[PDB]
Amino acid sequence: YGFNNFNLSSHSVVYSRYCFSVNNTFCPCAKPSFASSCKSHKPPSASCPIGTNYRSCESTTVLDHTDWCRCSCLPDPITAYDPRSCSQKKSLVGVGEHCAGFGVDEEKCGVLDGSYNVSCLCSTDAFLGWSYDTCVSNNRCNIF
């Protein structure tokens, strides 16, 4: 979903704060038709991969509007108001297992009016839940 690599100093060591496990049918991009139907707080949309469910969103009439749209994982999956609706589930890493995945901001995946002609992807800054620090002490990198 768009994560390519990091861009940090040579001695910069990255680490995950929170890892999110998702199903094979998860997709952070909303349906282009639903976004087109939206007129207030329109979520970004993009063509999701085949066999993956689009971003969970709902339409509710709020403040005299007729197509005001609410979505899950708001504002971000890490600090979502309700993890039940969010498709990203917090899960501790098992013994001998790597990170499940960074918390991706589904509000930055794709563009505002992405149709089915553009692939589903998210920007680099959308992936949260990571931090970094240096390893240099006495001109030596600490390693475990």
UniProtKB/Swiss-Prot annotation:
Chain positions carrying an annotated carbohydrate: N7, N23, N117
Protein name per the record: Spike protein S1
Covered residues, full protein: 448 to 591 of 1356
Role of this protein: Attaches the virion to the cell membrane by interacting with host receptor, initiating the infection.
Organism: Human coronavirus HKU1 (isolate N1)
